[PDB]
Amino acid sequence: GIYYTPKIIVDYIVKKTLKNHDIIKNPYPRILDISCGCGNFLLEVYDILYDLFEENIYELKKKYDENYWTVDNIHRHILNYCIYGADIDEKAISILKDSLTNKKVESDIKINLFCCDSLKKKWRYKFDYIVGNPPYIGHKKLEKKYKKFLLEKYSEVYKDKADLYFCFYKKIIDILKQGGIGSVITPRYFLESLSGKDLREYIKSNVNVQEIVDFLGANIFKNIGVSSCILTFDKKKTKETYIDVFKIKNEDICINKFETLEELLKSSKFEHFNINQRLLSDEWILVNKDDETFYNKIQEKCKYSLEDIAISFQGIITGCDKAFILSKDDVKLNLVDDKFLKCWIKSKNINKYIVDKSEYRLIYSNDIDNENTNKRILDEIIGLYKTKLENRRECKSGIRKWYELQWGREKLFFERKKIMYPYKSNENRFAIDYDNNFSSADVYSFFIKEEYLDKFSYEYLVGILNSSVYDKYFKITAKKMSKNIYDYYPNKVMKIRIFRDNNYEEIENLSKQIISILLNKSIDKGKVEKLQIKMDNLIMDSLGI
DNA sequence: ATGGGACTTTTTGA
DNA sequence: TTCAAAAAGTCCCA
Ligand SMILES: OC[C@H]1O[C@@H](n2cnc3c(NCCCCc4ccccc4)ncnc32)[C@H](O)[C@@H]1O
Ligand SMILES: [K+]
Ligand SMILES: [K+]
Secondary structure (H helix, E strand, O other), X not given: OOOOOOHHHHHHHHHHHHOOOOOOOOOOOOEEEOOOOOOHHXXXXXXXXXXXXXXXXXXXXXXXXXXXXXXXXXXXHHHHHHEEEEEOOHHHHHHHHHHHHHOOOOOOOOOEEEEOOOOXXXXXOOEEEEEEOOOOOOOOOOOHHHHHHHHHHOOOOOXXXXXXXXXXXXXXXXXXXXXXXXXXXXXXXXXXXXXXXXXXXXXXXXXXXXXXXXXXXXXXXXXXXXXXXXXXXXXXXXXXXXXEEEEEOXXXXXXXXXXOHHHHHHOOOEEEEEEEHHHOOOOOOOOOHHHHHHHHHHHHHOOEEHHHHEEEEEOOEOOOHHHHEEEOOOHHHHHOOOOOEEEEEOHHHEOOEOEOOOOEEEEOHHHOOOOOOOHHHHHHHHHHHHHHHOOOHXXXXXXXXXXXXXXXXXXXXXXXXXEEEEOEXXXXXXXXXXXXXXXXXXXEEEEEOHHHOOOOOHHHHHHHHOOHHHHHHHHHHOOEEEOOEEEOOHHHHOOOEEOOOOOHHHHHHHHHHHHHHHHOOOOOHHHHXXXXXXXXXXXXXXXXX
């Protein structure tokens, strides 16, 4: 329900929006939290505002109504005109109202607190400053009735597999006053994800992004599996449009290293660099000058992409794995004819250059003709989960029989030489599958088009793709998920560019030697490491780095 | 108990 | 008809 933002980050965000406010010029700033919860941000906003007013009370008294501007009147003023909060949870709003009332401890004061869905409220004026931490809800945990509303009314930032907080970015930008400043902490995934493309376009074309703080896979929220970033944007009449990017360099740090977050950002734990907002394409490549030179060099040298030369596909989606996946030593497999059985691997079975021997079998139930010839398999293996299987979407509509795989794909795509890689990994792991391995969606596969077989071999491809050069090169634009995990999905893996030059033969031969060592029983992996270093040297020579 | 490490399903819009 | 994206991941241990 309610998530607690660490106090240091709250202080940083509030100071980011208010440290340079000219209260004498405008003693009526509107500061809004659109998902205020119990007031994590708004109470700190109250404290900052109270200091700001009390420090200039006499200047305000002289410049304006001298009877209105007294210290004893600051509290009331702040609540009447400055602090605004919205949240869909009425208990949180009640608690926050009590807190703001008890900031003073007569005639009653009207607190601008709204218990509503902030994405449906008719907002009747814009705001000078917007801060907070919106709700994050993905496409699976959002109700379909609400998602229809989002797809209709928030189509500019919300399509397909987008997230709820995209819409909060939209709403915050839309209700921000000209010259206003907004600062929020959200998931970092929209910076790189395919779903966030339109949201990135919206932000880039409607506000000036002041600062991005990328915590990468650091754990900012205790016991929460999410990776966070802090965005600061404004609607000021500026002529430069340069973004300050602070990228964490050590994900293992605890956030309470210093009293303030500014000390952490200025320290050696973070790196700083500037990105020209006008040079952002539909993809935001937020890297330092050395990494940008590296990336551009590789992009310029390589004339092909994997998408050009390869056919990609996601793995089997059974819809209920426990009903179709059995250990190869399970006695129940004696009931299943071997024509129905396929080898089954998980993402952990994928190493560099080769796949572990499979230990699981998939019952490719689509080839079961009818329920009377193979009644025993259905009665004793698959039918154990009939109730769950019948609740799949395609079974409810009758497209799929209750014992069939939900997305069984095409068998001929898997029963061939191909390259496989895990969907989430700490490093590049592209393996040649020789054993017709099937897998779930945690492993992706591709094979080379016939017309590119004489230009690229599987051995050469796994050679360059597993190199240190390509590990770094892919990670430059990859989607950082959690600590030591990057997404390896076709929507970015197929964008990897490859080359073909005079080092092709030696690179291919080194890859073949590595594969031969890795498949031998009396394995000595050290020479594999030495061969990999030599191949990395060849690749760096080829790409001019 | 918590914080850190190993590992990854099927629901879902298009 | 049937593709592929999506971590307020999930689950475990010392
Ligand atoms: O980050 C968590 C905080 O954010 C608040 N909050 C969440 N969602 C909000 C929202 N609209 C979205 C509605 C989506 C559908 C829905 C969500 C939750 C329950 C029932 C239905 N509008 C304002 N505050 C919101 C929530 O109370 C916490 O205080
Ligand atoms: K006066
Ligand atoms: K994390």
